[PDB]
Design a protein around this ligand. Structure first.
Ligand code: NA
Ligand code: NA
Ligand code: NA
Ligand code: NA
Ligand code: NA
Lengths: 193, 193
């Protein structure tokens, strides 16, 4: 029996397994099945394994050197709350071109690892981080595919609740490794509306 | 404008870009093109970027906590030479089931990261590492596909010289990150005839 970070039903209730109508070759290994309504379903066993791995991966960096990126609206709150807990830097909303490549921009930063919400939406950040040799972690849905993403977290990266539980779990596990008290609830990470 | 770790011609002479007659969905994003003879060609730009990232990541671990695994014969020497330089542990030849999951087994170890030569050949190690939450790094050829590999290094992982230059580069970059002198030639890493 596999031991999940949370009861399996919690993952399903959050809709992390709900993909899109599109499947990429890169994501096939994470797709459990395709629903009759054409929607692809992600493997929660794989998601759980990847969240654990990502938490360990990220705990190998000093907090301030971690940069989270997310233009997608429902990801802003989860990203900011994750940062509140982990101590990572973040950029939500429009990512300004040159933020990682132009030392003269006021927004310029030099993180050692970049974590984006969606490689398609946050493509500018992914491309720049890769051009500068910075490892890229990313949430990838069935429709995503990027040769520039180094560490993948296969999950619904669009749903309000799905994003809340994933960022919440990542922050929770990183805090555990760090021996930092964490009492936040999934609701605390969830975007309004 | 990209800057390779070594003259591009060196990568080609080693045949790292030469894949097999098969292409998985997992590897599609790394395939540059398909040759006249049916052989898929890997993207050396991505390989170079990935070797750089893997070296950085691995240098984030106490060397003794890194475990290299390789049953494939042409990978033994490269793996042993990499370990000589890096200080990592390794298991070449048959990987005994239970090595990462059975504490009573004499060969039992608790590495913090596992790096295998081929996820199909070294599937036992990949499966066990994943089952215990240990991040998995792997060399993946066009024919490979594994949801259990966390960090991928897209390259020919069968060729004698292909393996020598890849392990050589990784070791060189890790030593460089440490400052450790590195005077080995690619030949010093190549399996004998
Ligand atoms: Na989705
Ligand atoms: Na990248
Ligand atoms: Na707690
Ligand atoms: Na090959
Ligand atoms: Na794994």
């Amino acid at each position: 029996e596999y031991e999940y970070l949370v009861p399996p039903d919690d993952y399903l209730a959050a809709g992390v397994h709900i993909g899109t109508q599109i499947k990429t070759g890169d994501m096939k290994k994470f797709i459990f099945k395709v629903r009759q309504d054409g929607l692809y379903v992600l493997d929660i066993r794989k998601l759980d394994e990847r969240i654990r791995v990502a938490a360990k991966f990220l705990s190998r960096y000093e907090p301030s050197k971690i940069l989270l990126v997310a233009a997608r609206q429902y990801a802003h709150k989860p990203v900011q709350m994750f940062s509140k807990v982990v101590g990572s830097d973040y950029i939500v909303g429009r990512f300004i071109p040159g933020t990682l490549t132009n030392p003269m921009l006021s927004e310029y930063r030099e993180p050692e690892v970049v974590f984006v919400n969606d490689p398609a939406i946050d493509k500018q950040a992914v491309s720049e981080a890769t051009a500068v040799g910075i490892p890229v972690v990313a949430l990838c849905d069935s429709n995503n595919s990027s040769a520039d993403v180094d560490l993948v977290i296969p999950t619904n990266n669009k749903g309000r609740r799905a994003l809340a539980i994933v960022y919440w779990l990542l922050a929770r596990e990183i805090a555990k490794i760090r021996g930092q008290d964490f009492t936040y609830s999934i609701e605390d990470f969830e975007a309004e509306l």
